[PDB]
Structure 1
Amino acid sequence: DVVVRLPDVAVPGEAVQASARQAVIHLVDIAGITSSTPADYATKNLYLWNNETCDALSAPVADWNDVSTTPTGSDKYGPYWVIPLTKESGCINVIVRDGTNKLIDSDLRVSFSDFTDRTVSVIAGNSAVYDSRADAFRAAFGVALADAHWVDKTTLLWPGGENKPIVRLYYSHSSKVAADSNGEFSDKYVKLTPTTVNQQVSMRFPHLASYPAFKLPDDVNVDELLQGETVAIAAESDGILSSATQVQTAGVLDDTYAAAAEALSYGAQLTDSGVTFRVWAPTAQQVELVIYSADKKVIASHPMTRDSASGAWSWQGGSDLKGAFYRYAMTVYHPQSRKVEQYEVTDPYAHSLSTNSEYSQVVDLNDSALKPEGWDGLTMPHAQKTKADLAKMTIHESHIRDLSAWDQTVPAELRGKYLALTAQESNMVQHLKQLSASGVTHIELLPVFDLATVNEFSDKVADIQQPFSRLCEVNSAVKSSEFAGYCDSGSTVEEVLTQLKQNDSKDNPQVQALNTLVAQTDSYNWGYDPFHYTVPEGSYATDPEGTARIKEFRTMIQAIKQDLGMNVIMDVVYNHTNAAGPTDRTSVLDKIVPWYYQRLNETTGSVESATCCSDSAPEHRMFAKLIADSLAVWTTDYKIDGFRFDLMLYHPKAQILSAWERIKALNPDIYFFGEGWDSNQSDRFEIASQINLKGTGIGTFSDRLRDAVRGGGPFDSGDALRQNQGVGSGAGVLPNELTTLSDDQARHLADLTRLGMAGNLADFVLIDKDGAVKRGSEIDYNGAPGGYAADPTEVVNYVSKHDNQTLWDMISYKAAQEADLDTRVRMQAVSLATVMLGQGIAFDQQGSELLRSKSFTRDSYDSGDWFNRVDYSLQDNNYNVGMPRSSDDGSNYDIIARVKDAVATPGETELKQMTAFYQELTALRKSSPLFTLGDGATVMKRVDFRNTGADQQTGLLVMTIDDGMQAGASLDSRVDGIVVAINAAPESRTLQDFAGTSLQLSAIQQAAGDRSLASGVQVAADGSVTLPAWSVAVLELPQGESQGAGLPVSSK
């Protein structure tokens, strides 16, 4: 065998160092360093020019056809250029050429800031700027990137060796595959001969199927190569190295181990004989189980037993280890650092944690000590068995602090805690009970798994209800801040933020300024930042040290189900981890099985960040299993009625469906839904998207009705926030001063809205804005088909959610100056009526019934108690409490200043009216099975619309729900049909579509009287209906002694 080796030449030094007003660029001639011919550099030249970005050149020649900037000199390693400078700071613009052809196809930007001696090297066909020729030389003849992919036992996908004579999988157990002192690569290796990709490999990694394939001997000891660094290497016939790169091994790891590893259970497990510990770590050299005392002293250390089939490590000990703290002491190679790392890691399958998740803890979740009294018989107060069960779901999306941080009627020690939901006499709980009785059915909880971004050591935390001096004790940036004078003040941070409201403006955004520092060290975060997937969050417990949070969490769940009467949904975030690599405190999965649980760039091997953070890999089998095992615990041990998957579109459809069947085997009524946008991962697998989930029963948030009713889209800014009026804010019927919405555009929004009120089915047939027959899927939504679902239970409609501006803030951006406060309250209820009276699952943000505002904050995840406040004492809606944070809403301060003060801020009278409006809407939703048909074909045969086509009265939404014989049986004994009429318009309107029938106003609305959304509706003797401006009316035909003719859908 030929010995792979470096170039038979030295590692180059610097040819010349720049002097004052000079810079030097070396071109390192890799190919001519392979000598042969003493190559000629006469045609090499640099194109140099100044612009607004880089302007440090003294005599730049702008003529692109000028090729006279030839090398100042050259040696065996390549030419160099001495470039005069006007200054020694900043940067210069360089293109490196041969004649007029670029040898680097990229404008090079050489910064004197990053390169202090202004003496840099570059290589042809590469855009990187190196500080020395040795650096660039070692780049070319050393390990770089990670584009080889060991994807099963016998196959290695790599481009860097396609049609090269020598191609090779080297491996070193304990050091980094560096050439030895004889410039030779003398480490052990396996031999690869070109081959043809499996049909099962391409079906597994389709984003790689165009990679050049290679074969491994049918007898390689994969167990041994995967114990250390592997480096795929190639070179030419002489043996001079061509390239060398690191290997990604998740493919082979799954081929080798996953079948065996999936049969095992993981974490610290109480058996009848004792406790069994098991962690999956197929590449680890050693795993030691470290037992800790309650004071976190090592009291035992146990080398674990490796199972060579699964790559899992196990140890068994006594039952007295229940309650013990533990970590896994790992000895494992990490490709990012290229070191065999040694560190202790918490259990990825942890079910109990110490304060701030520093240690995992052995726990038996079944202990009656961890259960509220009665736990084992806690039942689901709302059925989820049938589709008509599911369609009835009416979700109230809430956050632990948003619920109780501000409520003085919650005991002080329960504020911002799980146990605030047990404070039966608080304003918050009494108000939620009111919502439940009126037809809100589900609480959805923003992250209550163990998040990373709140410090659970209370001494390191300052909240705005505490003295400003506590804020200075714990946030050392405050002393350096223009708020430092307040450290002495003796007043709370809350008091200071209030006092700062007076002089706050788009010119002096001071409330936001103080709050940005507050955000760093407070108790507040949405929490989309997973530390441990299957432990409750610690900071929401009264005591975060140990098992306390488990009983407190379950006590909350029981209170919601048993005292409030609602089902509970959990937000789960399996699409990313909080950190990765061998360094960061919150890297758990990537410390134990490096590069397996994260999704990597196929070339750099860098962990991807398209989700926000550290993208995870649910396409890999053991993460798929981790997700499924985790959900099993939340389902069985915490009695969670359903799960909302954050960025579900980043998961394979097959993985979500797999997880769902696993969980349905535990509880058949469990409900799955999520964000099914476009992840850009369709090249790797069929993503779990709105489109691909058609018919599966997996729900998705529909952005269709959302944007039609709100106006615009979530990326609007500046004037577009006001110009883009929605149906709810008077598009085309009550225009504001800036908008140019046409009647056609407004009628298109009404199409989307009607479509969504019928469940946003792909196959639902309606009359569109132009009078034309269209299928649900034929209504455009930003180019995509609008309707996309098979059943309404697959669609979650909403007009407000934790992310993006509240509904009230959108209405304030968009409402014409002439809409007075009462009209804006009706715009809110009218907007919500499209959701509450539609066939899709109904979803809403906590506080929409209180006109909730965030002071125009569009992304409030870290904006603290101040901007996320919800006042259950009903004094205001949190509007106009300061300019929102400039980092995300600064480019909106202008439009905000123009619209902010058009009308008064909602006070107690408006909040009570909105709450009555909202309860009236939810009571209507559950008043009849007709609103919640469940089945897509049943919707199609019973749901129609009047006031359609090109001469529709703009903004008037009229839906009919048939309960007469030309659709089927009478689902409702009381009525033969229902008419839903939403008149989102400043004019009163009259309906003649129902003249002659016995139409009459629903009893709920008649009982609300002057407070009804239908106050002032008139039904004439002949059956014509007059609708007030900005109203919602639900009309019925009373049922006769047999099922009548009702409101037959017309066949279009």
Structure 2
Amino acid sequence: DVVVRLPDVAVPGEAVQASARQAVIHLVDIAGITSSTPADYATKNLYLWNNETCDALSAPVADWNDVSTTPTGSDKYGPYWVIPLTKESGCINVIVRDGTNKLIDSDLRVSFSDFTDRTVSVIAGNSAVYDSRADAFRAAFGVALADAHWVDKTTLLWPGGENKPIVRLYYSHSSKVAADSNGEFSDKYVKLTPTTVNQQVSMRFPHLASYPAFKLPDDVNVDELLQGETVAIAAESDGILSSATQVQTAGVLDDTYAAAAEALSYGAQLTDSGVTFRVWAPTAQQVELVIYSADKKVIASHPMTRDSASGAWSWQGGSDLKGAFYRYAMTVYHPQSRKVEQYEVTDPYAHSLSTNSEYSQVVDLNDSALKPEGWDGLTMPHAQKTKADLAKMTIHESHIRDLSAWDQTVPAELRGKYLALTAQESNMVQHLKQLSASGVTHIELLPVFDLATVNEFSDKVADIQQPFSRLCEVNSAVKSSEFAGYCDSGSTVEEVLTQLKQNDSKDNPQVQALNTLVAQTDSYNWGYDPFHYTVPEGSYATDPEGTARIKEFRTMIQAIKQDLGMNVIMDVVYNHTNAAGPTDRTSVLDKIVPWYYQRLNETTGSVESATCCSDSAPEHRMFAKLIADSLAVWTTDYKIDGFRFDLMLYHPKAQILSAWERIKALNPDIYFFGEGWDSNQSDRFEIASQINLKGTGIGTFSDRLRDAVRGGGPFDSGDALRQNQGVGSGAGVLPNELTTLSDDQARHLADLTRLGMAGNLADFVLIDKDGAVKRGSEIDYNGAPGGYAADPTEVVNYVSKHDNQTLWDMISYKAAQEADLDTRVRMQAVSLATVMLGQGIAFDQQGSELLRSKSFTRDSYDSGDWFNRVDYSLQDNNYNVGMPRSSDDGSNYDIIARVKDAVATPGETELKQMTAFYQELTALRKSSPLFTLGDGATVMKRVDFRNTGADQQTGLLVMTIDDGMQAGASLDSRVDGIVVAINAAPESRTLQDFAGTSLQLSAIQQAAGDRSLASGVQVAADGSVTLPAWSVAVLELPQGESQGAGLPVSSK
């Protein structure tokens, strides 16, 4: 077997050697094998200058604009420069250029001690200095990238080995694989041979199925090779290296250890009789369990016991370890750094933590001391068993700080804390209590698992309610900013921001300028930055040290379900981690089992960031297990009723379903839903998207009705934000001065809205804008089939959410100048009516009932208490409180300045008016089982629409729900049918469709009088119904002695 070595004969020689008092620099640039003339290097030049570090340069030409330092000469291997030196010692500063641009960015320092002959060579885009053109030429023949994949015991997929006489897998336990001084690779290796990828590997990794396959000997000691670095190397029959790359081992890790590891349980598993610690680390060379005292002093370090079959490490001790802090000391090779790292890491299965997640803690969640009184008997206030039960789901998407950060009626020590939900006398809790009584059924919580983006050490944080002096002491960026003068003032940050409002504008966005600095060290963040998946966040607890947060979190859950009467949904973010690699403080999973828990680029091995951050790999067996095990704890130990999967689309459909099967065994009525957009991961596996999840029972947010009612889309910027009016803001019927929307375009949005109100079903049949008969799947949504679901319970409709601009801000961007304040409040209610009175599950942003504004901020995740403010004292809706963050909304400053002051900012009168409209809508939603049929087939048999086709009155939505003899059994003893009429237009409209039918206005709306969305509606003696501008009316056919004729769905 020939020894592999770097090129040594077919290598470029030296153009010239540096003589006395001079240096020489070669720019390796070999011409084509077909070249016939000397290459042109007239534009090639060097920028020479000497400073403190290097002053050997003799008379260095200044002025960067000078390009006169061109090549002294050139040959087939590139040009070269003869630099006049002042001495043959020290060094020189050089930057290779091609005119004015840099061929090599980084500054180059040529050390005369490193290269005695003062004759070096460099290459474009390398930045490294070589002693010869030959060495530089060989540099391209070293270990680079990581496009070789060891997918199973004996299969290695690597493009670089194709048609290569010598293909080997070199390995080193404690060293980095690299050619020695002789240019040879003396490290040990195993021979590879061309083979054909098996169906097994093909099915597991479809995206790698076309890669050249190589077979390892069956007697290969996989375990030992996985303990260190492995490099795939290829060379010619003569032993000259062709290429060498790093190896991605996730596949072989699953094939070798997954099954055995899946059968075990992880974390610090404490029982009253003892404790067993277990962590999966199949590639680690050593793992020690480090025990810390309360004061964080090492009490003991225990070498753990490795299980050969699973690659898991365990240690068993006594029950006295209850409450102890701990970390796992790892000795493991990390492919990113290429070295055997040594570091302590918290437990990925941690269930308790110290302040700021620095140490994990041993805990038994079953302990009565960690449970509020009566916890075990806590019941779910709303049923989720049948589809009809699920359809009644009406969600209020909330955030811990958004809820109480500004409520002065919430005790000061509970503001921004889980416990604020227990302050029964506060404006916030009383408000939620009334929303519940009116029909809101679920509270959805933005990230309450352990996030990383808020420092849990209180002395390291400064909030706007505190002195500016505190902000300066904890934030050095502020102290060195233009705001430094406020440091020794006597004002609070909030007071300063308030004073900056008058002079704030697109030309001087000073409010956001200061707030951007504040955001770095405040207590605010949505928290889509996972540090630990199965421990509550610490900053939301009154005491973040230890187990305390567990009981407080439970107390909150109990308060919501028992005292507020609502179910609880948790936002989970298993699609990515806060960080990866061997150095970041928050990298947990990627430190323990490098390159396994993250999804990597097939060629470079780099952790992908499509989610925003450090993409995870739910397709890998042990991560799928971690996810399922985590959900089990939130379900059983925290009694969560449902989960909203953030970026669920980055998860395999099969993984989400498997997790659901596992959790249903714990809570048979648990509900799963999430964002099912397109993750572009279809080449790797079938994704959990709106389309692929049809008929599975897993819900997905629908962007159809959302965009049709709000107007436009999430990618709009500039004037498009105003031009793209929606059904809720008068598309077609009340055009603003910039829009060019046609009647046809407006009617298309109405088609999408009606389809959504019927549950966005693929098979629901309706009459479209042109009078044509169409199935939901035939109504187009930006190029894709509109209706995608099998049952309405698989669809979550909404017109506002934490992401993107609030509904009020959108209406402010789109409303015609002539639409007065009162009309805009009704537009907000009309927009929400399409969701609340529809068959799909209803979802809404906390505060929509208060016309919530973020001062036009599109993505407010780190915009603090200021832009995310919700005033439960009802003074205003937080509109017009300063221009939004310039980094992301700066391009919208012009349009904002133009539309912002069209009308007055909402006050208590408007907020009370909107809350009334909102509670009327939610009360109507639950006033009859007809609004929430649940089953798709039933929706198709009972739901229909009027005012459709080419002769329709634009903006008028009329939906009928049959309960008559032709629909089947009477589901509502009080009525034979219901009519939902939403007149989203500035004209009064008269319905003649129900003449001689004895229609009556809902008792709930009648009770509200002139405060009803139906105020002014008239039901004439001839049976005609007239609706005022921007109104919503729910009419009913009273049921007599027996079931009536109802409102049968028309044959189409």
**TM-score range, shorter-chain basis?**
over 0.9
Distance across 2 between alignment mates of 1:19 and 1:486:
62
Deviation at 1:456, TM superposition (A): 0.2
Q: CA deviation digits over 1:479-525, x for unaligned, max 9?
A: 22121111122111111111111111111111111101110100000
SS in structure 2 at match of 1:160: helix
Deviation at 1:191, TM superposition (A): 1.0
Deviation at 1:179, TM superposition (A): 1.5
1:391 touches 1:793 (CA, 8 Å); kept in 2?
Answer: yes
Deviation at 1:28, TM superposition (A): 3.8
Matches within 5 A, 1:139-288: 139-271=139-271, 273-288=273-288
SS in structure 1 at match of 2:534: strand
Is 1:539 the counterpart of 2:539 in the alignment? Answer: yes
Deviation at 1:43, TM superposition (A): 17
1:32 touches 1:38 (CA, 8 Å); kept in 2?
Answer: no
Deviation at 1:9, TM superposition (A): 6.2
SS in structure 1 at match of 2:755: helix
2:561 touches 2:567 (CA, 8 Å); kept in 1?
Answer: yes
Structure 1 stretches of 4+ with a deviation exceeding 3 A read: 9-139
Deviation at 1:66, TM superposition (A): 24
Match of 1:653 in 2: 653
Report the identity percentage: 100
Segments of 5+ residues of structure 2 without an aligned counterpart are none
Matches within 5 A, 1:987-1026: 987-1026=987-1026
Deviation at 1:631, TM superposition (A): 0.4
Q: How has the CA–CA distance of structure 1 residues 277 and 926 changed in structure 2, closer, same or farther, with 3 Å as cutoff? A: same
Does 46-55 or 232-241 show the bigger shift?
46-55
Is 1:344 the counterpart of 2:326 in the alignment? Answer: no
Distance across 1 between alignment mates of 2:515 and 2:612:
23
Does 491-500 or 404-413 show the bigger shift?
491-500
Distance across 2 between alignment mates of 1:245 and 1:302:
36
Distance across 2 between alignment mates of 1:99 and 1:449:
54
Distance across 1 between alignment mates of 2:368 and 2:131:
64
TM-score by length of 2: 0.92
Q: CA deviation digits over 1:200-244, x for unaligned, max 9?
A: 111110110010001011121110000000000000011111100
Q: How has the CA–CA distance of structure 1 residues 117 and 146 changed in structure 2, closer, same or farther, with 3 Å as cutoff? A: farther
Match of 2:586 in 1: 586
Does 112-121 or 695-704 show the bigger shift?
112-121
Deviation at 1:72, TM superposition (A): 6.2
Q: CA deviation digits over 1:735-783, x for unaligned, max 9?
A: 0001000000000000110010000011111111111111101111110
SS in structure 2 at match of 1:140: helix
Q: How has the CA–CA distance of structure 1 residues 138 and 453 changed in structure 2, closer, same or farther, with 3 Å as cutoff? A: farther
Distance across 2 between alignment mates of 1:113 and 1:723:
67
Q: CA deviation digits over 1:822-845, x for unaligned, max 9?
A: 000000000000000001000000
Q: How has the CA–CA distance of structure 1 residues 243 and 43 changed in structure 2, closer, same or farther, with 3 Å as cutoff? A: farther
SS in structure 2 at match of 1:1026: strand
Q: How has the CA–CA distance of structure 1 residues 107 and 799 changed in structure 2, closer, same or farther, with 3 Å as cutoff? A: farther
Aligned pair count reads: 1052
Q: How has the CA–CA distance of structure 1 residues 1021 and 34 changed in structure 2, closer, same or farther, with 3 Å as cutoff? A: closer
Q: How has the CA–CA distance of structure 1 residues 54 and 300 changed in structure 2, closer, same or farther, with 3 Å as cutoff? A: closer
1:70 touches 1:81 (CA, 8 Å); kept in 2?
Answer: yes
Q: CA deviation digits over 1:427-461, x for unaligned, max 9?
A: 00000000000000000000000000000000000
Q: How has the CA–CA distance of structure 1 residues 487 and 50 changed in structure 2, closer, same or farther, with 3 Å as cutoff? A: closer
Deviation at 1:397, TM superposition (A): 0.2
Distance across 1 between alignment mates of 2:111 and 2:510:
36
Deviation at 1:477, TM superposition (A): 1.4
Match of 1:626 in 2: 626
Deviation at 1:263, TM superposition (A): 0.3
Distance across 2 between alignment mates of 1:704 and 1:111:
64
Distance across 1 between alignment mates of 2:57 and 2:940:
71
2:31 touches 2:76 (CA, 8 Å); kept in 1?
Answer: no
Q: How has the CA–CA distance of structure 1 residues 497 and 126 changed in structure 2, closer, same or farther, with 3 Å as cutoff? A: closer
1:509 touches 1:883 (CA, 8 Å); kept in 2?
Answer: yes
Q: How has the CA–CA distance of structure 1 residues 707 and 43 changed in structure 2, closer, same or farther, with 3 Å as cutoff? A: closer
Q: How has the CA–CA distance of structure 1 residues 925 and 177 changed in structure 2, closer, same or farther, with 3 Å as cutoff? A: same
SS in structure 2 at match of 1:24: strand
Match of 1:742 in 2: 742
SS in structure 2 at match of 1:1004: helix
Q: How has the CA–CA distance of structure 1 residues 100 and 477 changed in structure 2, closer, same or farther, with 3 Å as cutoff? A: closer
2:830 touches 2:1030 (CA, 8 Å); kept in 1?
Answer: yes
Q: How has the CA–CA distance of structure 1 residues 116 and 825 changed in structure 2, closer, same or farther, with 3 Å as cutoff? A: farther
Is 1:331 the counterpart of 2:303 in the alignment? Answer: no
SS in structure 2 at match of 1:862: coil
Deviation at 1:8, TM superposition (A): 2.7
Q: How has the CA–CA distance of structure 1 residues 189 and 768 changed in structure 2, closer, same or farther, with 3 Å as cutoff? A: same
1:49 touches 1:57 (CA, 8 Å); kept in 2?
Answer: yes
Deviation at 1:102, TM superposition (A): 19
Match of 1:599 in 2: 599
Q: How has the CA–CA distance of structure 1 residues 204 and 991 changed in structure 2, closer, same or farther, with 3 Å as cutoff? A: same
Distance across 2 between alignment mates of 1:757 and 1:726:
15
SS in structure 1 at match of 2:74: strand
Q: How has the CA–CA distance of structure 1 residues 104 and 565 changed in structure 2, closer, same or farther, with 3 Å as cutoff? A: same
1:33 touches 1:77 (CA, 8 Å); kept in 2?
Answer: no
Distance across 1 between alignment mates of 2:971 and 2:95:
75
Deviation at 1:135, TM superposition (A): 8.2
2:6 touches 2:138 (CA, 8 Å); kept in 1?
Answer: no
Match of 1:868 in 2: 868
Does 379-388 or 111-120 show the bigger shift?
111-120
Q: CA deviation digits over 1:293-339, x for unaligned, max 9?
A: 00000001100000010000000011100100000000000000000
Q: How has the CA–CA distance of structure 1 residues 84 and 316 changed in structure 2, closer, same or farther, with 3 Å as cutoff? A: same
Distance across 1 between alignment mates of 2:960 and 2:113:
69
Q: How has the CA–CA distance of structure 1 residues 199 and 97 changed in structure 2, closer, same or farther, with 3 Å as cutoff? A: farther
Deviation at 1:108, TM superposition (A): 18
Q: CA deviation digits over 1:787-846, x for unaligned, max 9?
A: 111110000000000010000000000000101000000000000000000010000000
1:327 touches 1:346 (CA, 8 Å); kept in 2?
Answer: yes
Distance across 1 between alignment mates of 2:503 and 2:845:
31
TM-score by length of 1: 0.92
Deviation at 1:549, TM superposition (A): 0.3
Deviation at 1:281, TM superposition (A): 0.2
1:32 touches 1:78 (CA, 8 Å); kept in 2?
Answer: no
1:26 touches 1:80 (CA, 8 Å); kept in 2?
Answer: yes
2:962 touches 2:1047 (CA, 8 Å); kept in 1?
Answer: yes
2:31 touches 2:39 (CA, 8 Å); kept in 1?
Answer: no
Distance across 2 between alignment mates of 1:101 and 1:564:
65
Deviation at 1:27, TM superposition (A): 5.8
Q: How has the CA–CA distance of structure 1 residues 110 and 520 changed in structure 2, closer, same or farther, with 3 Å as cutoff? A: farther
Deviation at 1:21, TM superposition (A): 20
Deviation at 1:7, TM superposition (A): 2.1
Does 793-802 or 36-45 show the bigger shift?
36-45
Q: How has the CA–CA distance of structure 1 residues 514 and 53 changed in structure 2, closer, same or farther, with 3 Å as cutoff? A: farther
Q: How has the CA–CA distance of structure 1 residues 49 and 632 changed in structure 2, closer, same or farther, with 3 Å as cutoff? A: same
Deviation at 1:364, TM superposition (A): 0.3
Q: How has the CA–CA distance of structure 1 residues 317 and 108 changed in structure 2, closer, same or farther, with 3 Å as cutoff? A: closer
Q: CA deviation digits over 1:714-755, x for unaligned, max 9?
A: 111111110000000000000000100000000000011001
Distance across 1 between alignment mates of 2:905 and 2:874:
12
1:7 touches 1:34 (CA, 8 Å); kept in 2?
Answer: no
Does 243-252 or 125-134 show the bigger shift?
125-134
Q: CA deviation digits over 1:922-979, x for unaligned, max 9?
A: 0000001110010111111111000111121000000001111222111111111110
> RMSD in angstroms over aligned alpha carbons?
5.6
Deviation at 1:1037, TM superposition (A): 0.4
Distance across 2 between alignment mates of 1:967 and 1:54:
90
1:384 touches 1:390 (CA, 8 Å); kept in 2?
Answer: yes
Q: How has the CA–CA distance of structure 1 residues 975 and 430 changed in structure 2, closer, same or farther, with 3 Å as cutoff? A: same
2:146 touches 2:604 (CA, 8 Å); kept in 1?
Answer: yes
Q: How has the CA–CA distance of structure 1 residues 36 and 309 changed in structure 2, closer, same or farther, with 3 Å as cutoff? A: farther
Q: How has the CA–CA distance of structure 1 residues 420 and 25 changed in structure 2, closer, same or farther, with 3 Å as cutoff? A: farther
Distance across 2 between alignment mates of 1:284 and 1:779:
54
Deviation at 1:998, TM superposition (A): 1.2
Q: How has the CA–CA distance of structure 1 residues 300 and 197 changed in structure 2, closer, same or farther, with 3 Å as cutoff? A: same
1:32 touches 1:77 (CA, 8 Å); kept in 2?
Answer: no
Match of 2:1049 in 1: 1049
1:44 touches 1:98 (CA, 8 Å); kept in 2?
Answer: yes
Distance across 2 between alignment mates of 1:472 and 1:350:
35
Does 84-93 or 492-501 show the bigger shift?
84-93
Q: How has the CA–CA distance of structure 1 residues 1015 and 21 changed in structure 2, closer, same or farther, with 3 Å as cutoff? A: farther
1:997 touches 1:1022 (CA, 8 Å); kept in 2?
Answer: no
Q: How has the CA–CA distance of structure 1 residues 182 and 86 changed in structure 2, closer, same or farther, with 3 Å as cutoff? A: closer
Distance across 2 between alignment mates of 1:85 and 1:880:
65
Q: How has the CA–CA distance of structure 1 residues 780 and 87 changed in structure 2, closer, same or farther, with 3 Å as cutoff? A: farther
Distance across 1 between alignment mates of 2:832 and 2:54:
53
2:807 touches 2:848 (CA, 8 Å); kept in 1?
Answer: yes
1:697 touches 1:794 (CA, 8 Å); kept in 2?
Answer: yes
Does 179-188 or 395-404 show the bigger shift?
179-188
